[PDB]
């Protein structure tokens, strides 16, 4: 009955995803999300492909930074898991 | 020999316009002057950047309007835009 103990697969994923530099959020759903968000600001707006790529890159970098900060908060609170209070305090300290 | 420049008389005029009788201390006077200077500098810098962004050379009404919509929160931006447009059209009506 081969089975990896919890945590090891998480560590492998963490190392593999920190070593890599590719784009994580799927492109098409993010493009649709951006189009919907911009739809209520202007009628029938158009978007350049490079603009959507820049939006995705900036948003992913911001999320990675926020998750790193909230992981710091979690390991500060004597635990290894993150819950919404952690990211809430991280945002509040960051000055959102 | 001194010709220091400040927004004291104008902020006092607007204060007496909104509140019939309320004093402003010297510290509050300097603070309001600094706030006015900071907001003006921010809006002027944003308008300058916006003029440089389309190979244009004129700071016009649209530049400051977009700068106000950029650097101000929602309700504040809407009210400031309405007030500025009203002032501009009143001036041009003369």
């Amino acid at each position: 009955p081969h089975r990896y103990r919890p945590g090891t697969v998480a560590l492998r994923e963490i190392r593999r995803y920190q070593k890599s530099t590719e784009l994580l959020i799927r492109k098409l759903p993010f493009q649709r999300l951006v189009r919907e968000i911009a739809q209520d600001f202007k009628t029938d707006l158009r978007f350049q492909s490079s603009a959507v790529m820049a939006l995705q890159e900036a948003c992913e970098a911001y999320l990675v930074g926020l998750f790193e900060d909230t992981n710091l908060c979690a390991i500060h609170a004597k635990r290894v898991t993150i819950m919404p209070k952690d990211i809430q305090l991280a945002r509040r300290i960051r000055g959102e | 020999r001194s010709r220091k420049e400040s927004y004291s008389v104008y902020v006092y005029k607007v204060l007496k316009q909104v509140h019939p009788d309320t004093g402003i201390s010297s510290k509050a006077m300097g603070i309001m002057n600094s706030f006015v200077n900071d907001i003006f500098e921010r809006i002027a810098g944003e308008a300058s950047r916006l003029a440089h962004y389309n190979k244009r050379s004129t700071i016009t009404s649209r530049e400051i309007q977009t700068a106000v919509r950029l650097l101000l929160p929602g309700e504040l931006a809407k009210h400031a835009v309405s007030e500025g447009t009203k002032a501009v059209t009143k001036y041009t009506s003369s």
Partner: protein, 78 residues
């Protein structure tokens, strides 16, 4: 209906890149809300930048500008 399109595995992958081992099930709603707020702000700035230029296409240049004006600049796009 579409904000959900940023699904649970994508959030988990982003968090793993961020450097966190375990993830609770109540964080996906919060991170989707954070995503929506941040994208609303940045896309509003980009949209008003385009509206100033009498354009209908949000160019990448104005988006990166708007990010720079937000206080979080970005390279690789001019």
């Amino acid at each position: 209906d579409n904000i959900q399109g940023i699904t649970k595995p994508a959030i988990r992958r982003l968090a793993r890149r961020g450097g966190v081992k375990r993830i609770s099930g109540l964080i996906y709603e919060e991170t989707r809300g954070v995503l929506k707020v941040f994208l609303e702000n940045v896309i509003r700035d980009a949209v008003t930048y385009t509206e100033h230029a009498k354009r209908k296409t949000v160019t990448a240049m104005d988006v990166v500008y708007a990010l720079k004006r937000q206080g979080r600049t970005l390279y690789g796009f001019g």
